[PDB]
Amino acid sequence: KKCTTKEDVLEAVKERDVKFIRTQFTDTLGIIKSWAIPAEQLEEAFENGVMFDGSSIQGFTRIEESDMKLALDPSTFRILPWRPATGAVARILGDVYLPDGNPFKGDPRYVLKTAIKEAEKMGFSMNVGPELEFFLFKLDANGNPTTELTDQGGYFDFAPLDLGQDVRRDIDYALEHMGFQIEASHHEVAPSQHEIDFRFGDVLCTADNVVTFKYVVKSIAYHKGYYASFMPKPLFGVNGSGMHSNQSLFKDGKNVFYDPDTPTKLSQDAMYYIGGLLKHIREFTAVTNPVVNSYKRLVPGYEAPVYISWSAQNRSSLIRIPATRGNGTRIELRCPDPACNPYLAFALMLRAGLEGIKNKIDPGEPTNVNIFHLSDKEREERGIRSLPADLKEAIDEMKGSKFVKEALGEHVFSHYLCAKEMEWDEYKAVVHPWELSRYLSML
Amino acid sequence: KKCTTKEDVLEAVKERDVKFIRTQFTDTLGIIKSWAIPAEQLEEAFENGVMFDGSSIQGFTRIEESDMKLALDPSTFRILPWRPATGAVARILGDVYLPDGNPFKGDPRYVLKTAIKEAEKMGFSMNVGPELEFFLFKLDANGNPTTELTDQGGYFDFAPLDLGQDVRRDIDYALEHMGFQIEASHHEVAPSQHEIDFRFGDVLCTADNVVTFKYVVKSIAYHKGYYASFMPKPLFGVNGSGMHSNQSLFKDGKNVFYDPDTPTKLSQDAMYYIGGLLKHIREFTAVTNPVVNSYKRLVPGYEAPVYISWSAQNRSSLIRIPATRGNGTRIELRCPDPACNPYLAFALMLRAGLEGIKNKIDPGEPTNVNIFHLSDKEREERGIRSLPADLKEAIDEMKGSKFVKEALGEHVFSHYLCAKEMEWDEYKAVVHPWELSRYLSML
Amino acid sequence: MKKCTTKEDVLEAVKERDVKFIRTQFTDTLGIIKSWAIPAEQLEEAFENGVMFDGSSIQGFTRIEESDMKLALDPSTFRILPWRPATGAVARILGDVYLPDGNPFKGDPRYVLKTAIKEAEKMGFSMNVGPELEFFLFKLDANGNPTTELTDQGGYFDFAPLDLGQDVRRDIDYALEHMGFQIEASHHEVAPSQHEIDFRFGDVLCTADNVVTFKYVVKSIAYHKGYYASFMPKPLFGVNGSGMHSNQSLFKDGKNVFYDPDTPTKLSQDAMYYIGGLLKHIREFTAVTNPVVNSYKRLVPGYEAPVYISWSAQNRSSLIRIPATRGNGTRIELRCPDPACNPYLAFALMLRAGLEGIKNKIDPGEPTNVNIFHLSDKEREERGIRSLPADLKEAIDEMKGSKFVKEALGEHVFSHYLCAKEMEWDEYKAVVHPWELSRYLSML
Ligand SMILES: [Mg+2]
Ligand SMILES: [Mg+2]
Ligand SMILES: [Mg+2]
Ligand SMILES: [Mg+2]
Ligand SMILES: [Mg+2]
Ligand SMILES: [Mg+2]
């Protein structure tokens, strides 16, 4: 089941009776985009490319069309894990080009590719294993999503044990049937919350899978009567959903972060990589935490980190070093939530870590104390800064950042910020029922 | 009906058959406070004072009691506008003292008195006429307040014309029966919204009346089946409720703001007074706009001002000069909402205006253009700043302000900020239904 | 079924039986069953290098920070679950938890039971356990949530229920036998909709693993037939609660060391000392055998649950009972625990207490052949008959100052267990219950 050439794809389409091909790409804000191609037209698509409206990539801030061409990558062909009676369905990715023949710089996948390209200039290749947390909710009588609980279980609980036990198994099976190579799946801290850990793979292939994961899990749950939610904080008072990103660099086949003779067995480049991450994380929190609801997860008192720090012992730090060493040496960034665009988030993580190695950015001493247990003046002395407290603050930090603008390009940078600003200007004017409950009788 | 001495009060209590006396004071956050005294004990109260728990003034941030004494002011005695079958009811104010005999610096009324005291050092006395906007809503089946409309009328509409016509008349009559001397009352822009304009009077007496107004209107409406709401923005998409504060200074009986020979007929001190207001308004917006809901009114596109500016022509400026001249020359600050503590708000307005005259603070050229019609870069050149966009930003501006700390005192200053911070930390973590409507199906 | 010994045994069985997912199985400090799924393709590498996982999951709801830990899979614990999804077969597997430095994690309750077994081996003893698990079978509401709605109104040993509940009850028994549980007996219990399943009398470590497996297997099977299986100690007022009677005996040289043909009761001196140690320390770890606030709504007089510390051979209502069987079947039954307890911690502490009795020759005193429930405080005080802790707070306080429980559990488990139970009690003691409104709202 390893596809390399267009002839590999075409023969598998004929042998497996694939009738529809679905393109897969994402817009600037991480929404999954697609259109359907009948398989009869697939051979022409491989030869000539497929023309489509490129403003779909631009987000919801689009006004004008832009004719663009999608050059299909046969190595991304993959059959979807459901079987219509008519025939099989498969997804395929590709690269977006302008009519003049130049690659469209506004595709988030292209943005990730340039970061991979800059990493290869120094001989580095990046591997990532994301830990994706989500909620399994009930549908109402009309089939609409709700936040109604499907179980009351806790961390690593063997739950649910009713019919929800079968949908969770169906989700894991569907991913395995598609070649995901899941490492582990388990119940998360909050009721009805679940986590699936990806295999440690190369960043580009992993990023494509994070996108595929989201609509596969969504579709499988829907067809069983449940709703899979990737909201950061759908429920007050319980754990939010993060997307922890374990990352590692390789050069000449060996792990760049590992060093057998150092006290912590962590290399100098590992320290530099953390320094770049710590130096720039505030500038692209708006990308790792892209929606207004993201910052309801980034509040003190839960697993989510709100203070910029690193440690090898405390969990609640922004960056944590797992105990694993050798070829598996990795660092874990714990702030992102599964609403982020994986292409933009992974690219900025790579660029920030690369800038740490380039500029020999010291990360400081690790914070082994639970920072939540500290006063504001204590953190002030130790130089412990915090993440932006809402989307608007994150927007302002990203607005004036030379690092983020150069890494995304002036087109992705502008369009992402403009959409997020429109988002906040809508939210900031809403009068919420909490305000009514608090002030109607008081004032 | 003019009371001057304790014997004036005691005889009127006997003649008018007053059976209960209600003390009236406010806490640090502007909530109206009270306790009941049977009229038989009133004569002892005038002689010795009344001991009460002073931590009631401290707000909801109180932990320890503090025994304090209220020295009743017989000139504030006033009979309430409803008539129980048992007997009449009256309100009375006073000054709060510590057991050692010193005035308690934490009473907001005392804070206003010191600003009046500092104004008298330069020969100034301040007169204020507040324009109080409120909403008239329906009660549900259980008598609880709602936001259900009582009319659909607009600006200056003769509405409502149903039974709501009688409660609005009852409210105006009750205030007139109590000696308020209302200037005008009319329908406001939003449906079910109403405004009552006070007589131009001295700041201390006016501030006491703003407090009395709130619970009188509340009680009169309740007993007719309606709810009077003083929320800034109870309803999205329609006008909020402000408390415009027209103010003027007098020295030697003549209006300090008037000058017959100047082009605009406005004196130099009037310009200085505006300059101090403009220089400091950002530092005490947290007092004029004290609740989270206040900044749902301070959004662009309605009558509320969000840009720091002054003009004699445009309404939508933060400070506006009415056309009236001579003894009636006044300036109007349009940002406050009726949730503010009138003692703290008027005191800071007086101090800021006084600091303008002391330091000869130029207010700049007036902005006669509708600032809302301008780009961000246009306002940048003209030095046009904006008000804080939420309660947290207003808290931070007040936290580091030497002017506000000195004018309120270190005890009111600390307690006010601590309560408002607890307020924001509760609001910032709430997951609102708007987030569910926007992100549950998307993410 | 089959018995697996090597990793090659398990890997073969995965292929020939089309097992697609392996579920790890362990417990947190409080006894909550913990698991995560491994794809069968990953299983071969799991046997070679172990599986990294967040070991703070073992701490319970008192976990402060993450802790990387390794699970070394035990091939002999591989067992196929008794449901057959269309996708493929499912199996569970246990293992040992190791720290990154290579040492075993002392906070795993399974490790705690294993060191108790090691103390028995030092004195030449191996311990066998047969538990009797009581549970309730309730209806689900219209939304699929558990209720306390009855499924039958039968009593002790009744042939009930006889409606569709007869089938789910039989499905539970069939699936346990399908996994090789070798059930001794299953019957209706005293309370309506209450049931009992009697485990095979076998090795303590294997039996403790089966108790954890039993709970989620019964719950999942009941769930899929529209019923809820409850292991609450006392879900309903006014009827019997659910207990976990723990039969036990020691063996040495393949002989039962509790049996003596020569003595009058046909019990050896070691059995007397073993009882003495149990009676000496039972108060100090009642918080382990009866771990939740609801446990002490069962530990009240009048419903078969023992509240007084005594032993006897005749009447069951004693804390410790001697069944009539002798010879190789000689055992002593401890009747205080409920199915909410962690079996690893409860069995470990029973063993340690009994072994402490043997090594210190602790006399158990005269048996109390009368029903203690018929005695005054004066009569009970005259015979020096003590009570079990009356609520979780009292049991916590008795466990907090026990040097014995701290040594047997280890510091990590000891503090983490107590801290969690204290937070549980502090939350409970502040609640204003509807019973208080019914009694006081009108009166005061
Ligand atoms: Mg997690
Ligand atoms: Mg993690
Ligand atoms: Mg108006
Ligand atoms: Mg006005
Ligand atoms: Mg029984
Ligand atoms: Mg029994």
Author numbering:
A (entry chain A), B (entry chain A): 5 to 447
C (entry chain B): 4 to 447
What does the paper say about this structure?
The enzyme, glutamine synthetase (GS; EC 6.3.1.2, L-glutamate: ammonia ligase) plays a central role in cellular nitrogen assimilation by incorporating ammonium into glutamine, which serves as a carbon and nitrogen donor for the biosynthesis of nucleotides, amino acids and lipids. Like the Gram-positive GS, the Mm GS active sites are formed at the interface between two subunits in the hexamer and are comprised of five regions; the E flap (Mm residues 303–310), the Y loop (residues 369–377), the N loop (residues 235–247), the Y179 loop (residues 152–161) and the D50 ´ loop (residues 56-71), which is the only active site region contributed from the adjacent subunit. Like other GS dodecamers, the Mm GS dodecamer is formed by two interfaces; hexamer and inter-hexamer interfaces.
Interestingly, Mm residues 165–169 are proximal to the catalytic Y179 loop, suggesting this region could impact GS active site formation. To test this hypothesis, we generated a Mm GS(R167L-A168G) mutant and performed MP experiments on the mutant protein. The MP data for the mutant, performed at 75 nM, showed that, unlike the WT Mm GS, it displayed higher order oligomer species. However, the population of dodecamers in the GS(R167L-A168G) mutant was much less than we observed in the Gram-positive GS. The structure shows that the Mm GS(R167L-A168G) subunits are similar to the apo WT Mm GS (rmsd = 0.49 Å for 432 corresponding Cα atoms). However, the GS(R167L-A168G) structure shows that the substitutions led to the formation of a tighter interface compared to WT GS. These analyses explain the intermediate impact on oligomerization observed for the GS(R167L-A168G) mutant compared to WT Mm GS and Gram-positive GS.
